Structure formats: structure tokens, C-alpha cells
XYZ file of C-alpha atoms in Angstrom:
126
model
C 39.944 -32.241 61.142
C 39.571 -35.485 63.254
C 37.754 -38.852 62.957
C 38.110 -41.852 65.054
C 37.200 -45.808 63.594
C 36.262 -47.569 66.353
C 36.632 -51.421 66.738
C 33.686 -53.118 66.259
C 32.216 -50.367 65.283
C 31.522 -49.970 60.999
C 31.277 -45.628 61.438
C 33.254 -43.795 62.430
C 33.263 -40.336 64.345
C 34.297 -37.588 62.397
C 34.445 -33.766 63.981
C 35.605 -30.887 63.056
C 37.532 -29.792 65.513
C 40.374 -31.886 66.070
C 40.858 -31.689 70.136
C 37.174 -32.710 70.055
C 37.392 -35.509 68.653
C 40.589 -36.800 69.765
C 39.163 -35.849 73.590
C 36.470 -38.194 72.648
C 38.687 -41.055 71.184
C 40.328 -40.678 74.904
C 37.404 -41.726 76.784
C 33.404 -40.761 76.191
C 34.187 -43.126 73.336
C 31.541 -45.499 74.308
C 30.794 -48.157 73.597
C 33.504 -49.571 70.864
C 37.083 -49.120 71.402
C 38.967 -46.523 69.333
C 40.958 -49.036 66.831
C 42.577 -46.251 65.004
C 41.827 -42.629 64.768
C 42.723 -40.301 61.539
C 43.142 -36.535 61.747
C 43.591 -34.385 58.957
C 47.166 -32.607 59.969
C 46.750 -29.249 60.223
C 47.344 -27.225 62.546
C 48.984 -26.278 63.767
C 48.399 -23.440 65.919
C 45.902 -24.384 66.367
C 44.133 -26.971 65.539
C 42.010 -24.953 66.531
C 38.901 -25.266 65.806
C 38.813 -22.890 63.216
C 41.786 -24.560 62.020
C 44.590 -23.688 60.073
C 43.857 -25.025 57.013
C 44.162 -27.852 55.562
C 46.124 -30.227 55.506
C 47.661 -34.117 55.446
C 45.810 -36.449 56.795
C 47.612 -39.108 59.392
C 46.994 -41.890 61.706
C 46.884 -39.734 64.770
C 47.150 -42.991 66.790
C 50.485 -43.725 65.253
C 51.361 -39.989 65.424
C 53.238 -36.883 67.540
C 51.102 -35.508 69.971
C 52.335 -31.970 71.881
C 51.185 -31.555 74.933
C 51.632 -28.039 75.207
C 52.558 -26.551 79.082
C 52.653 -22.877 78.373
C 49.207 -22.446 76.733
C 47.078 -24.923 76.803
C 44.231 -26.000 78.822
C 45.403 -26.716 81.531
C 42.922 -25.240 83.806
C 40.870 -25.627 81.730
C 40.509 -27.504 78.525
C 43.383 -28.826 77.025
C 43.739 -28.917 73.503
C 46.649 -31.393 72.069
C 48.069 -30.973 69.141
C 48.265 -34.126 66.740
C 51.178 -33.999 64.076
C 52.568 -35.980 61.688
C 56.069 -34.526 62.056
C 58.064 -35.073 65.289
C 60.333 -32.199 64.290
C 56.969 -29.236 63.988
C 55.575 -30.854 67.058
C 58.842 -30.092 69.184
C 59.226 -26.954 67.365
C 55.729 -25.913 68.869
C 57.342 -26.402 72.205
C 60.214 -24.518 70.729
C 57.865 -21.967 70.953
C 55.713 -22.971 73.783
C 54.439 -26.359 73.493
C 55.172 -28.362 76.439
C 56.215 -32.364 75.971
C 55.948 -34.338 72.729
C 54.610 -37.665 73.120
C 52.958 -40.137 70.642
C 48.963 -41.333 71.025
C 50.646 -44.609 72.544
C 52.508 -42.858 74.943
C 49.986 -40.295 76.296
C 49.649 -39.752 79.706
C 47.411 -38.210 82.032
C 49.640 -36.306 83.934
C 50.901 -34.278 81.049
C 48.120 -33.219 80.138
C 46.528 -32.502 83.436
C 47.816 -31.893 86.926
C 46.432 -32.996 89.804
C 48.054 -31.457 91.982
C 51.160 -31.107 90.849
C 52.721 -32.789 93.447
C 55.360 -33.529 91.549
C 54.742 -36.235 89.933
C 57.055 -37.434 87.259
C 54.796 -37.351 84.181
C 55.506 -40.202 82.439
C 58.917 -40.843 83.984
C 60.434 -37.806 84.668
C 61.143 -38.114 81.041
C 59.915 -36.250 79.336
């Protein structure tokens, strides 16, 4: 689950769905600023949606996000995966996953291409 407290703002957004939420706390977030957003861990595989139960619940702004390259959105929509642990996050990309990044250090071009074009995603770092 996901919810975002934005500044200013005395309610905050709660959804479901996890890569809603945080999509929202990324931009359509409108008219406060996102001051800190809370997700309810879980997921993992998901975060889907449907979820995979339940789980811990975390400041995904101060959190490991996994950007994942192999399945993702990419075309698409992109679905990021917010987890407390840095060690399950990278172990997603283990699997398939793609970068792990924190909610502070997410970037645009991991999580979409442009063009591809090479462009160094954050800094070729990652």
C-alpha cells in the first residue's frame, strides 16, 4: 500500500496500489509538495496491485527504490518497486530488477528512455 503527506497539505493520499501512488507523489501531485510519502512494504513482486501481502510500513522517501530494466514498464507503465531493504531490492535485480536507487536519487532516465541515446542514467553509475 502507498500514501503520500504532502506539505502544506493536512491529508494525505493514500492508494492502494503502491506504483499509483508513488507515480502520483512524482508529479500530478498538485498542488502541495510531497513532504514525505509512506508505503506499506510489501511487495515485492509485485507491488502489484494486487499486492503481495502485507507488510512493513516505511518512509518510501527515505527508502530503496528498484527500477527494474527487464520487466517493467518501460514502454509502457513503469511500476517501481519501493523497499525498505537495500539487500531484497538488489536481489530483485538479482533476478531481473534493473538499478537500485533511493526516492532522493531517482531519475528520469532510469525509469524511462527517451531515446536511449545513451545517456548515462544518473552517471553512468548505476
Amino acid at each position: 500500500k502507498a500514501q503520500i503527506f504532502l506539505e502544506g497539505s493536512p491529508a494525505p493520499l493514500f492508494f492502494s496500489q503502491v506504483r499509483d501512488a508513488i507515480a502520483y507523489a512524482r508529479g500530478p501531485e498538485q498542488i502541495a509538495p510531497i513532504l514525505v510519502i509512506y508505503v506499506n512494504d510489501m511487495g515485492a513482486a509485485g507491488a502489484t496491485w494486487d499486492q503481495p501481502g502485507d507488510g512493513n510500513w516505511i518512509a518510501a522517501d527515505k527508502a530503496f527504490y528498484v527500477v527494474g530494466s527487464a520487466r517493467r514498464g518501460g514502454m509502457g507503465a513503469p511500476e517501481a518497486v519501493p523497499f525498505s531493504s537495500r539487500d531484497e531490492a538488489a536481489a530483485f535485480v538479482l533476478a531481473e530488477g534493473g538499478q537500485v536507487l533511493a526516492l532522493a536519487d531517482i531519475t528520469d532516465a532510469m525509469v524511462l528512455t527517451p531515446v536511449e541515446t545513451g545517456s548515462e542514467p544518473r552517471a553512468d553509475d548505476e
